[PDB]
Ligand binder design. Structure first.
Ligand SMILES: C[C@@H](O)[C@@H](C(=O)O)[C@H]1C[C@H](SCCNC=N)C(C(=O)O)=N1
Ligand SMILES: C[C@@H](O)[C@@H](C(=O)O)[C@H]1C[C@H](SCCNC=N)C(C(=O)O)=N1
Ligand SMILES: [Br-]
Ligand SMILES: [Br-]
Lengths: 244, 245
């Protein structure tokens, strides 16, 4: 029944990939947490695109996003991610981490409502200091891997202070992978604007009889290693027999 | 092309490869065009069997017979032939493992009058619930074709059925079968064995970034040995049509 255990054997997966970072797991049935690094599990970083989870919730709950079908027209400014230079709905904007769509949401939400909602969500340090459309990229907001798990457990249980409908739509938008053995609902992030540059993957694995929450971050000096966010998480999930 | 339904007999090669007979129906939502290997069998009506778990789930949720997708339905303690049925279930695992006994209990609590009204409102197949209120989708009067399954699924996809948006969102969650970075499949299997001819079903849709492809297939299923062919043949057609890589 001991709340948090360190499992340093997971460091072998970081070392194999010449990488540094943390994986945090939470067994919902047992109410027990596991991590390779208790210190880094509680270190706070810019959320970057993992902020698209609360941003989606707030946009839906305020009617900035009507539903997951509403089209957000490309503003016609060519950016260096090809998938961003096109129309999106909530599903594809989350999938392709389409920053400019979410910047527009944030502008329409505005500072007062963004701040109130992140306090109601107990989200990270709850600090939106900076620009309302970029604070999750280079403003004051910080969140640890353990704080990501706390937030995700509320979302999973529809316990956040927004409608059940808003929570159901965001959980649909988080869908990443599914088969006959598991479902992954998750969101990637890449924080580059303030050091240290890190990759995120946060979400959960739905099994028939349990839910395993996860939050990982890792040093990401270049975009070359971004695939390691999922690969290292899956190495840990497989070692723990959570997925085959 | 303007044609509602187009016949593509090349898909019969996927049936023949597996010494099988049946139909695949596809509907391109963007183009409002349908495709099938067999226009006649596409419109032949059969017992829905476990594909009936889609409307049954919707009606159970809408009436409050099922509170949500977490509510536990305790095993009645009767050992049945399918191991996965002999345990507690929620809506997600009851759909996944086609747990008939749970859905029979839903049907009893919904009752004949409300079941009949709802299937009329859904324009579901021949709308006929004659037989036992807790088995009519297995051995009663209800019949539905592959094209009628697509018509019903399009209403569900668009939240247009006459039940709450919430009921429709929960059932679409319960239908989740497969997802990756290229596509999402929401679907339901069926195996009709109580009245001849014995057939297998797979009905649902493929969500892409920019389109939805609805599908409904059935095939002759004399034994449970071939049940894997429902998904395998459908995927061979989806690949041929470049819907999935
Ligand atoms: C701040 C954004 O740039 C960043 C974020 O918000 O986290 C975007 C960029 C990439 S999508 C392609 C990744 N390649 C980046 N060089 C991404 C992600 O992997 O989640 N999010
Ligand atoms: C038998 C029917 O109740 C059937 C139905 O209601 O459609 C059940 C069992 C089969 S899978 C198991 C088939 N037999 C295996 N030995 C099934 C399905 O494939 O969805 N549902
Ligand atoms: Br809802
Ligand atoms: Br889903």
């Amino acid at each position: 029944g001991k709340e948090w255990q360190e499992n340093k054997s997971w460091n072998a997966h970081f070392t194999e990939h010449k990488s540094q970072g943390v994986v945090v797991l939470w067994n919902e049935n047992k109410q027990q947490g596991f991590t390779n690094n208790l210190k880094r599990a509680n270190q706070a970083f810019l959320p970057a695109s993992t902020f698209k989870i609360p941003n989606s919730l707030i946009a839906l709950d305020l009617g900035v996003v009507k539903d997951e079908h509403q089209v957000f027209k490309w503003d016609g400014q060519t950016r260096d991610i090809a998938t961003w230079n096109r129309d999106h709905n909530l599903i594809t904007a989350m999938k392709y981490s389409v920053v400019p769509v979410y910047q527009e949401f944030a502008r329409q939400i505005g500072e007062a409502r963004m701040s109130k909602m992140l306090h109601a969500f107990d989200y990270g340090n709850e600090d939106i200091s900076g620009n309302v459309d970029s604070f999750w990229l280079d403003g004051g907001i910080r969140i640890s891997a353990t704080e990501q798990i706390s937030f995700l457990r509320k979302l999973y249980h529809n316990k956040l202070h927004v409608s059940e409908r808003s929570q159901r739509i965001v959980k649909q938008a988080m869908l990443t992978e599914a088969n006959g053995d598991y479902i992954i609902r998750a969101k990637t992030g890449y924080s580059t604007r303030i050091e240290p540059k890190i990759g995120w993957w946060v979400g959960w694995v739905e099994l028939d009889d349990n839910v395993w929450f996860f939050a990982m971050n890792m040093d990401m000096p270049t975009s070359d290693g971004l695939g390691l966010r999922q690969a290292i998480t899956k190495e840990v999930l497989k070692q723990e027999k959570i997925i085959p």
